[PDB]
Structure formats: structure tokens, C-alpha cells
Symmetry: C3
Subunit: 424 residues, 3 copies
Amino acid sequence: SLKRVVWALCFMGSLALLALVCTNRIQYYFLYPHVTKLDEVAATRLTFPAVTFCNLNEFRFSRVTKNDLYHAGELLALLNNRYEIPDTQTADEKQLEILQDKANFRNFKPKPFNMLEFYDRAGHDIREMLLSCFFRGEQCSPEDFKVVFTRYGKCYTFNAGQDGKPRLITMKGGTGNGLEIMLDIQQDEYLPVWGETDETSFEAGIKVQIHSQDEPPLIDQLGFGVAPGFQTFVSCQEQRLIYLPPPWGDCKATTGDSEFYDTYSITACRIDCETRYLVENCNCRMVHMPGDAPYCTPEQYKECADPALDFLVEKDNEYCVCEMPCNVTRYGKELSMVKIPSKASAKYLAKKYNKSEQYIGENILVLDIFFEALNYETIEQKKAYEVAGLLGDIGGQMGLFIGASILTVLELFDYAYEVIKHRL
Amino acid sequence: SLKRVVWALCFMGSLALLALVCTNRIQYYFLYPHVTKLDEVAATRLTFPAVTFCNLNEFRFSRVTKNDLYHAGELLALLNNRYEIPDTQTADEKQLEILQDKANFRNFKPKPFNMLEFYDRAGHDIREMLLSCFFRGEQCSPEDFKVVFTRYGKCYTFNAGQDGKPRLITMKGGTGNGLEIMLDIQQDEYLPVWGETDETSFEAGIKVQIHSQDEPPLIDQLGFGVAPGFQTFVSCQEQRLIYLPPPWGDCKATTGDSEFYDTYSITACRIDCETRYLVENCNCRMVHMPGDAPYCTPEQYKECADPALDFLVEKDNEYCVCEMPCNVTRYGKELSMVKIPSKASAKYLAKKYNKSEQYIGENILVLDIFFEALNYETIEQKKAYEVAGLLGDIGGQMGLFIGASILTVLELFDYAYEVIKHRL
Amino acid sequence: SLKRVVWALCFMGSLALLALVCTNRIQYYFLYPHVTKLDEVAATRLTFPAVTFCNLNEFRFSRVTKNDLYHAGELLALLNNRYEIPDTQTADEKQLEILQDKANFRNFKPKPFNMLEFYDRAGHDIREMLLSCFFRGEQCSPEDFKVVFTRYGKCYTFNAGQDGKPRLITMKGGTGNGLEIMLDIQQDEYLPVWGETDETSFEAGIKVQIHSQDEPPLIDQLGFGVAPGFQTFVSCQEQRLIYLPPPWGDCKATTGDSEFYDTYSITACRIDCETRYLVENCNCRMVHMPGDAPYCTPEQYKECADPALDFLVEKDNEYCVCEMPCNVTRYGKELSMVKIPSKASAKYLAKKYNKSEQYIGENILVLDIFFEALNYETIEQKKAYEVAGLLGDIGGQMGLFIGASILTVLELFDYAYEVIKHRL
Ligand SMILES: *[C@@H]1O[C@H](CO)[C@@H](O)[C@H](O)[C@H]1NC(C)=O
Ligand SMILES: *[C@@H]1O[C@H](CO)[C@@H](O)[C@H](O)[C@H]1NC(C)=O
Ligand SMILES: *[C@@H]1O[C@H](CO)[C@@H](O)[C@H](O)[C@H]1NC(C)=O
Ligand SMILES: *[C@@H]1O[C@H](CO)[C@@H](O)[C@H](O)[C@H]1NC(C)=O
Ligand SMILES: *[C@@H]1O[C@H](CO)[C@@H](O)[C@H](O)[C@H]1NC(C)=O
Ligand SMILES: *[C@@H]1O[C@H](CO)[C@@H](O)[C@H](O)[C@H]1NC(C)=O
């Protein structure tokens, strides 16, 4: 009886250890773990990304009118609260006299107003910004950019891909085979800053955001700055990330049928959620937001929409729920600078563009964007432990400890069935 | 006999292959492999990191005295070896006459000295550096910084979290919802550099290190530079790395009860090990090192402590053994620049701060630190092959090749036990 | 009969599920998946990488001759098509009169020419560039650099490791324990740019590429720019990547016996493939390409070799097939800037180097390269699913569902063999 009892106790301990590691692997499985696969796939044809940039000015000074104050000088830091010029201590002569010429406001008939007219006309001409465009050694045109509207205002996009245009591709690396543009930020047309404000942008330069053709730009939250007086080499590395759907990951695996973007991205969910909340509140929308809804005369931006953004970012954080898409494609960047002009390259530019050497020194940048090498990194989340390997590990453990199988369990049911006649 | 012999030879080869792949998986297991899990977890509340910065000057020139030479001009590149001014060829008039006014050294009674008095008084006032502080659009105060002492000297920290203060959080991305500070590096108060030295810092600007509230700053080895004349956008990405303990990884999994830091980090182990070695050697410690031990009058820094650092970094590399902690939180950064001021924003600053336009051109920077997006990357080392999957794979292999189990092995012992009576 | 039939149907369904998940794991196996292992290994001795830099000028102006035009002014943007000066509108006086002095071309005997003589003599002296070299606080020498030839021309390399020199190592982090060099890009010696060109480099500064001693530099496609007037801190992080051979990965696992590089890299395959294609075409090679083949008088570069590069990059993309090597070692970099000189450090430099303060303001940079910390990241592709775990999972599944083994299959063959006598 004793040796059989020892055999039985070893069977009990073996079954208990089997149950322990089996629960270990089950509890491992229902965490749905996932691991990371990195890759560096070289390829010949690479889609050159969409470049987007805003000048740090919202709008030029010479292209506003007494109209454009009289509706819109309230929000845009040009009036007082009682419709007059703010404290203009130590101002330039003609700079103040043109503004005071606009600041009569006497017997003024109003004009039927929109913010989109103002951001169209008072903004920057790209034909007065784009000095020299180059792409793969071929001269590109100012009409090849695309106008968008951001929080900064009228902004531009190269290689947008929209309006049926083919996405531009590169065939070689290096700084010569990229986008090489020469821009003039036009510091003579910046806003008068004799008023005091907490958001008074003392800086000068450009803000550039690199993004795919998929997503709309989000320059306020994603872009990087580029100063004038420097050619800026921007090394780019394409990264094709693939995430996972839930339970494993967090992907909006659907097509993402948003109201205003047929394609889906993380920024599109953001901008459409904030759009939808504002159209819910103030019956009209901001200029950087799409919609069939109208825009508002600018009292309703500082009166209605801005505190809706404040309670939206503060208290209504649950009102926007955005899942990251699966096949995201980002662009790593590496910024480096060289100074421009030289002591030899100055006088040619000054003769060429009819400006002073001071103007060339403090008003021109050269944005230079190119891939470092013709390869894209691939960051995929692989499912670490599928149901098949679960069945393999459980079956291996049950093969080791008890040695039984599902056939053995079913014949155990049949052996109980032959014992079931004794109970009845 | 033949068919049974073939069955036996196939059993032998099957057992040998089983032993081969079993040794393959065992040798795989005792390497303790581990793989990488990347994640991008979005969240609403993010702890804004601790910002720390040193001006590149060690101490202002106007706040030193004939005292401060007479003890301390030896180490601090202001005396000769025989207590006189070094070679001051092509010096400014009053700049040299004030130093020579300090350089009489005639009938000088000494003064009871410390290095901490000198770095307190001769350093930079933060109230004479911090022009405008902003955080989330709310104006922060100069009293909200914290004074620390580094190798560069008196340095400052925003959002330190110490002295029971709550760690500051952000609720939105973009450059407006971050830390926006305007600083004056005060190039008029830099050191006279008419002496020659190999460590003669010809540069000018600020050095900034971003770190968690956990670790003390290590600006000499971790910080990045920021030049004046540029608003510098600093994109930040929080990364929560989780490593593994040994055998798998290299983690000090304990609480790390260091003598001078209750919390544990890699920099704390470094600074306490170097502290402990110096308190072992020179009976007193440097200013950037904590301790209950005193400091030294500056002959003992260039006489005792510096070659202890030299043999410490060179020969005593085994005297400091620092393991990286488990749940490290780093901050990826991306630097971009825009130029400041504009041609419009100059005269307002010059009127505002009572300085020349040259002063604004070459003396002011704007440090701008913000998260790119409200998400933190997660780099975890998962154990690749635990003991449970080991038992599963071994049990699966033994289920395939020989088909036996541990029950079969124990009954093989019992079958030998029934054969054990034949031997005795 | 019924209960046996139910046992048989459960055996059929169990066998079918077994076949399903078995095909799932086989199809998983022949994808050869691989996952990523990240590591951060700290170590004392780190090999300091090879630094390479080109001035953005190809060659100095004062070191060319009427010779050097008369052969070589055609390609090098100094002649017209009919051997005369291009449009020199708004030129400096002596700058144009020296060129016109070279531009007589009257009764000119030619001179036996090479491009390597011209890039040797007309380029930049490193002894007229390297103002102050420092490494680990020890002054390095201008003879410790190494001359190479790139597309930019005569370029230099620190810590090249070639000619039997030991690779330099660092023992401490921080900006003091790295390479600290002070350079003068010499904007007075840049090319006259009164001619118009699409590749007219208006910029000024230096281009620096950090690389291992293994690979030759590829500065046109890999380097980053550094402007003058800034000390540039370059944080470096060593990364030892290990890829996999095919089928798993894409590695040239062999030694890579290229014709001109005994060691193998990705850039070596590129430069030797383009070399081999050009030696196939124009019987002589460019200067940035190695070879026993000669070089060409410069009509054959703009006549033969450049369109061979054009059809090479465009149509002959299949003519170069380069696999990435296994144990690649890259160097992550992080660029930050501080301004140099100060208002105190100017006059010492101007007295020291016999130049104006304007010269110091717009002609000197300080390249500063150092490791952030004494640790290297390790990005290894581990094989995710080897043949051993395949046998374990299949054996576990066959242990679960049918419970059979390979012994059971062989005894099934023997049971068929006992049934094989009934057929014959
Ligand atoms: C989305 O991912 C699939 C592969 O899973 C690919 O076919 C498609 O091109 C991806 N889309 C984008 C925009 O990258
Ligand atoms: C050049 O600029 C000056 C002043 O800006 C102007 O008077 C002149 O007409 C301009 N000439 C050309 C050709 O643009
Ligand atoms: C340390 O890691 C644990 C999770 O393993 C977490 O609870 C804790 O907040 C972490 N500490 C820090 C400082 O990140
Ligand atoms: C402004 O600066 C000048 C010289 O620096 C000084 O004399 C004057 O008192 C200052 N005034 C104010 C209001 O700070
Ligand atoms: C190549 O990798 C092996 C380890 O697999 C190592 O011994 C060798 O040093 C590596 N070579 C280089 C140049 O990193
Ligand atoms: C300094 O430079 C001037 C002009 O460049 C020259 O005449 C003089 O000889 C130089 N002196 C020395 C000592 O280099």
C-alpha cells in the first residue's frame, strides 16, 4: 500500500505544480503582452513628406485697413478696450502715424466682415516670401505650395498631395537632393509691439512642422522653430510605426469616418473634436477649424470661444477621446545650422534682391530638408503570446507533469459514466 | 528481432535529438534573455519636469572683494602664483583699475572665509536674471526657483518639488502651455579673461539640464547649452523606462539608502561615491557635494581634492560601482531656435528694461520648455523566457520525441525497484 | 456503437483543431520573426569616435593660379563657357582685379595637371584652421589630423585610427573630457560668387560628420552643419547595433572583401560600387573615390562622369546592391549652441590671433564633442522563434489534442505493416 501511496502523493504534487504553472501562463496570457520589432528597410523610392510652415507674424502690417481695425482690432492686440491705440511710448514716427491715421474712427461706415478675408489679405504673400525654391536640383514654383489656416494664421504647405497632385518622391540622399528653400520672414512687416501682453511674441523667425500627407498640420503643438540668418539642415528619418488594436494595443482600427477628414489621424480627431465642441457652443467656428459652420465677428472669439477652449482643455478632458491609429508614419528630425550669408555671398544677394546687407543679415533663412539615408525604420508591436503558443505551453506542461491529454480527460468522463450506473 | 531493433534505433535517435534540443533550450534559459516593449501611453495630467540652469559664469565680477581674492583668488584664475594680477595686456581701463584697486594687498587683515559665502554673494542674483517668468500663461515668481550649487557654482531650479512643494503639472501641449522664461546672462559681469588658461571659457550663454525631481542635477555631464539672442523651443518627451533586476538586467532594486539622498538615482550614487572618497581623503568636501563635512579654504582644492579626482577618474574606477535604478524616467529633448528680438520687438524691450538695443541683441535669451504631446513613451524590459515557458517547451519536446512524462520516469524507478530485488 | 462514435467524432475535431494551430505555428515560423533587445551597458573605457569635417568652401581663393583656372576653371564655376570671367556686377576692387589678372590667358603655356595637386594646394591648411586643439584637457596637435578627400574636397579627420595609430579613448564624461577644437573657417578666402549657379553655396560654416574608425566618411549625405560664432556642444551616445543574417535579417555576414576597403561598411559598398561603375565608364575616377585608376582633367568630369552619376542614381539603381553589416556601431548626437565670444572674451582673442573683433565675431567656431555618459546602447535583433521552440510548441500541441508522439506514429506504421500482409 505504501509504494502506491508514494506514487499517489507524487501524482498529487505533480498535479499541483501543473496547476500552478498553468495559472501562471494563463495570467500571463490575459495581460495580452506585446513586444517590439525594429527594422531598417532600405528602399529606392521614398515619398517626400509634406512640409508646412508659418511665419511667426500672424499678418503683415501694411495690408490692414481702418476697416480691419474697426471690426477686428479688439482681439488682435491693436485697440484698447475703449477703441483707441494702447500705450505707444517710444514709437517710430511713420509707424505710429500710419496707425493713428487708421485710428481716427470718425464717421466710419462699417464693412461686411469675415476673418477669412482678413487672414487672406493681411497675411504674408508666399510670392513675397519664397525667394528661391529648389527640389532635387529642379526649381519648384511658388504656385506649388498650398494655403492652409492655423492658429498662427495663413500658412503654407509644400508637397501637400491634395487636389489630386502626386506625392513627390526623392531618389537620393544628401542636402542637394532635398527641399532647399530660401525665405524672407519680412521683419519690417511685423506687428507694433508697443502694447503690453503676456502673449507678446518678441521673437522673429519661422515655425516649420514636417508631417505626412495624411494628417493636417498642428504647428502650435508640433512644429519646431527656425531662426533667420542660418541655413538649417534638417535630417529626416521616416519611421513607419504599426501599433496594435485593443486588447493588445490602443488603435482606432476602423477607417475613422470623421466629419471633416476622410482620412484618420490623431490630429484630425483632435481638431474635429474641438470643432464639434465649439459648433455645439458658439454656433460658429474658428478659422483653423474646418466646418460648414460660419466664422464669428471677433467679439465672439474673445467672448465665447476662448473660455470654451479653457474649460475644454481643463474640465472637458473627457469630451475628447482620441485613439492613435495603427499605421502611423512619423518623421524623426535632426537640426543643424550654418550661418548665411558669408562675407562673399552677401553683396550678390544684396544686389540680387535690392536690399541692404543688413536686410540679408537679419531677414533671410534657408530651410533645407532632406532624408539622411534612403531607409525607413519600422517599429512594429508584435503580439508576444498568441493563443497558439498558449495551447502549446499548456499542452507541453500537461504532457510533462500528468502526461494526460484531452482524450484522457474524455475517457475519464466515460470511466465516470461507467461508474454513473452505480449511483442510479 | 530486426523490426524491434529498428524500433529501438529510432528510439535512440529520438532520445538523442530530444537531449540536443533540450540542452539548446536550457542553455537558452540560463542566458536569461529579455526583450523590449515600447509603448506610447497618453494621459491628461503630466508632471512637469524639473528645470535646472547655470549661467556659464561662475560668479559676477562686481560682487567680489579684496577679501575674496585674498583667500580665494588662487584657485579662481585671478591671482598669479606669487599673489599678483596675471598678464593683463590690452585691458579695459576701469575693468583693470578696479582689479588693481583690489590688488594692493597691503596691510590686509584676513577674513574668516568659506566657499559658500563666496558662491552665495559673488554669484548671480536670480532677481537680476529672471526678466519674465511664465507657466501655462500664469506668471511665476523668482522666489519659486531653488538655489543649488554645482561645479559651475550657484545655479537655479524650477519645479524642484522639494521643501514640500507640489510638483507642477501641465494640462496642454504646445509652446504656450509650458515654461517660458526670459533670462539675462549679464555679459558685463563675466570674469576678466586676460589671463591664459586651458579651461578659459571663451563662450557666453547658459547651460540647462532637464531632469526629474528624483535626481540631483549633473549639469557638467548632462546639460545642453542655450545661446543668448534666441528663443529656444525645447520639445520634451517623457520616457518611463523600467529595467530589470539581476540576473536578467542590472538594477539596484533596493531603495538605495545613500547617506545624503533618501531617494536613489544614478547621479546620486555618483555624487555620494565621490563625496565619500573625498571625505576619506581631504577631511573636507567640495561645494557641489553634500555632507556634514566642512568645506576647505581654496588651497586644499588645488592642493588635495583635484588630484584625488584625477586618480579617482583614472585609477580608482573600481572604487565607485553604480547600478542603474529600475523605474528611471528620462526626458527626450529636441532643440530649435528662433531669433529674438525682431526689428519691431527691440525698442519695446530697450525701453522696458532700460538697456541699449545692443544689450538686448547680445544679452537676452528666452528658454522655452514644453511637452510635444501629452503622452509618455514606455521602454520596459520584459523577461523573454521565464521558467514556466521553459517547463512548457521541455514538456512539449519530451511529449513529442519519447512521449514519456515524469510519471513515466517515476514508474521507471519503480520498475527498477522491482528489478532491484534481483541484485540483492 | 454510439458512445464510441462520439469518442471518434471528438477525436476527429481534436485532430482538426490540432492541424489548425499546427499550421498556424508553422506559418508563424517560416516568416522568421525577430524581436528587439535594448540595453544600456556602462563601461569605463570607450573608444572615442572619429571626427571628420569639411569647410564649406572647396578651396581657398588665394592659392589658385592662372594654371589652375586654365585647366580647371571650367568645372569649378570660375570661367564662362568661352573661357572668360562670368557676370561680375557689383564686385570688390582687388577681388576682381586679382581674378582679371589671372584672366589674361594670353600666350599661356599649359601645365601638366591633376585634380589632386589642386585640391592639395588650393584647399585649406589645417595649420591655418586649427586654432586650439584640446582632448581630455591635453593639447592635441595639428599633425594628429588626417587628410581625406570628399566631394567638398580636402577635409580632415581626428582620431582616424589609420596608419597604425591607437584609437583614442575617453575616461570621463562632460564637456571638459572630450574633443574641444577652435576653428577658423576663413570667410576671406571663400569663392567669388558673382556668377550665378543653382548650387551656389551662399552659406558659410563647417560640416562635421561623426563616424567610427571602420567606415570612410560620407559627409555629403551624413554630416551636420555647424555655424561660426557658436561653441557647439555635441552630445554623443554610442550605439552598438547587431542585426541578423538572412533569412531573419539583412546582413552581409561575410568579411566584405571589397576592392579598396578591407573592412566592410555600408558606405564602403556605396563608394566602391560607384567607383567600379565609373571606372567601367570613363576610364578614370573622381577624387573622393579610391582606386588605382587615374583621375581626369576636368572636362571629363562635366563631360562623362556626372551624367554617369545621374543615370546611376536614376536608372542604374539595380547596379548597386548594398547589404547593411551585422555589428554596426552608430553615434547618436544632440546639438546645442552657446554664443562665442562674450563681451569679455573678445579682446583677448583679437589680441591673441591678431584679428579684428569683427573677425572673431563672424569667423570662429568651437566644435565640442563629448559623450553624454559612459554607456553604450545595444540594439540587438534576437531571433524570436527558433526551431527548438517550434518543436516544443508542436510537441505540446500534439501532447494536448491527440496525445500521440513520434513513437506512436512509428508504431502506427508498424501496425499498418502487420496489416500490410493482408493486402498481399
Ligand atoms: C496602413 O498599413 C498597411 C499595412 O498594414 C499599408 O498597406 C498602408 O499603406 C498603411 N497606410 C499608411 C497611410 O501608411
Ligand atoms: C530697388 O529698390 C529701390 C528702393 O527700395 C527702388 O527705388 C528701386 O526702384 C528698386 N529697383 C528695382 C530694379 O527693383
Ligand atoms: C517606480 O516604479 C513603480 C512601478 O513599478 C511605480 O509605482 C513608481 O511610481 C515608480 N517610481 C518612479 C519615481 O517613477
Ligand atoms: C535707467 O538707466 C540709466 C543708466 O543706466 C540710469 O541713470 C537711470 O536712473 C535709469 N532709470 C530707471 C527708471 O531705471
Ligand atoms: C562585431 O561583432 C562581434 C560580436 O558579434 C565583436 O566581437 C566585434 O568587435 C564587432 N566588430 C565591430 C567593429 O564592432
Ligand atoms: C599683425 O597683423 C598685422 C596686419 O594683419 C601685420 O601687419 C602684423 O605684422 C602682424 N603682427 C604679428 C605679430 O603677427
